[PDB]
UniProtKB/Swiss-Prot annotation, chains A, B:
Lineage of source species: Eukaryota, Metazoa, Chordata, Craniata, Vertebrata
GO molecular function terms noted in the UniProt entry: methylglyoxal synthase activity; protein homodimerization activity; triose-phosphate isomerase activity; ubiquitin protein ligase binding
Protein name: Triosephosphate isomerase
Gene assigned in the entry: TPI1
Chief localisation class: cytoplasm
Annotated InterPro entries: Aldolase_TIM (IPR013785), TIM_sf (IPR035990), TrioseP_Isoase_bac/euk (IPR022896), Triosephosphate_isomerase (IPR000652), Triosephosphate_isomerase_AS (IPR020861)
Modified residues (Phosphoserine): 19, 78, 104, 157, 196, 210, 221
């Protein structure tokens, strides 16, 4: 039972209603292929706008959330607010969150548990730093990140794991197909060993870090790479080519 | 001239479209008196929603923002986005941001400079912790915080300073009118010595920390208290009595 190809567009802290509305209009007019799940993650001010403007064939994700339903957390939003705006996903543990904003594995884990308990899907991000890879500890780093996520997932149906090497995010330096495949095969083996075969076979493991129209077909051909989390290229019409990476 | 009374309602991480729509209906129906400036700060996912539903008599604030126009900051929003959604204020340096989320004085100062350069007004928050008050270093703490803010303000026209002792936030332990007046009068003194008499006379210094319908008149009567930043009571019709505290 094949895993459905998944492409998420992470707009990060970019865009305004004019430019984002135009990007949405491109997506709305595009033919989304078969057995292809497309999700757009706008800046938090525009979750509602995006969902209002986007055709229902495209889902909306929050870029982050907090770990309780309501409370005294100025500047935060909860899973319940995201669902209330019609969004069905949240991106958790993104590299920027971990390494610019200091979010811990423990905090990420708490967010995952709360987001899933409230009925959102979670795109859960993992990945090593260039110095970690240099020191020979890629697998150790991503296995520990994955473990903390797994400790907070009861139902993997609603989760997608996104492997993004830190050194590949926004640098132009896409992981080669071999580099991505190697990690993704190891991560799926982790799921098989630590959760179940059924979970290892059914869970999408998507690659991000400088995915572009020029790199996407060869990456998407790798048997353990199930899709993409796309930053820069998601603000360009190139995103449609990445959506069609398997065509 | 005399400083215009200022009330900010910080909804924090509370509410959904139904409940906030009901609250907004209450505010739209309410009297907003003479020479009172009222601002509501919704959760980030609802800035757009709140601005669309609220009558122009009430301004909208974001609860936080980041320090550049656009960029690779998953989960953040910029002053440009805030202005694009029709909001005119941002709250910066809120206690929760500093003490739960680790935002430094340095970062807050950067945000202040950026938000003001982008044409937003800023509600710039300061306040000592319980341990700092107990140690007797309130003044040293709040002056240092004010200095960092002042170092990043070229024009105080669109700044409001909000003193919220941490020990009063959400605790029900409202500062007494004396306690608030004592701090406010020192802050205005700081502004006189360090910026100008004119800035001291014209700059609103608002109090926050368990402001309630029962406490607001006597606080608003104090000559250096120019209004309120309201948390818990901003989620209730009680907010209207606080808006009308000098009536």
């Amino acid at each position: 039972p094949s895993r459905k190809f998944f492409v998420g567009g992470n707009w990060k802290m970019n865009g305004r209603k004019q430019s984002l509305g135009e990007l949405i209009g491109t997506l709305n007019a595009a033919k989304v292929p078969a057995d292809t799940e497309v999700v757009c993650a706008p800046p938090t001010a525009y979750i509602d706008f995006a969902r209002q403007k986007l055709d229902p064939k495209i889902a909306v994700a929050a870029q982050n959330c907090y770990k309780v339903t309501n409370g005294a957390f100025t500047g935060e939003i909860s899973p319940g607010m995201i669902k209330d705006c019609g969004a069905t996903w949240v991106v958790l543990g993104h590299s920027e969150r971990r390494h610019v904003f200091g979010e811990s594995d423990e905090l990420i884990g708490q967010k995952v548990a709360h987001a899933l308990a409230e009925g959102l899907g979670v795109i859960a991000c993992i990945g090593e730093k260039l110095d970690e890879r240099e020191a020979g500890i890629t697998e150790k780093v991503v296995f520990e990140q994955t473990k903390v996520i797994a400790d907070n997932v009861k139902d993997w149906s609603k989760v997608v794991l996104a492997y993004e090497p830190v050194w590949a995010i926004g640098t132009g330096k896409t992981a080669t197909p071999q580099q991505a495949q190697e990690v993704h095969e190891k991560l799926r083996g982790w799921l098989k060993s630590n959760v179940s075969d059924a979970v290892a076979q059914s869970t999408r493991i998507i690659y991000g870090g400088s995915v572009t129209g020029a790199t996407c077909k060869e990456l998407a051909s790798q048997p353990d790479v199930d899709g993409f989390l796309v930053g820069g290229a998601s603000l360009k019409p190139e995103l449609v080519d990445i959506i069609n990476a398997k065509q």
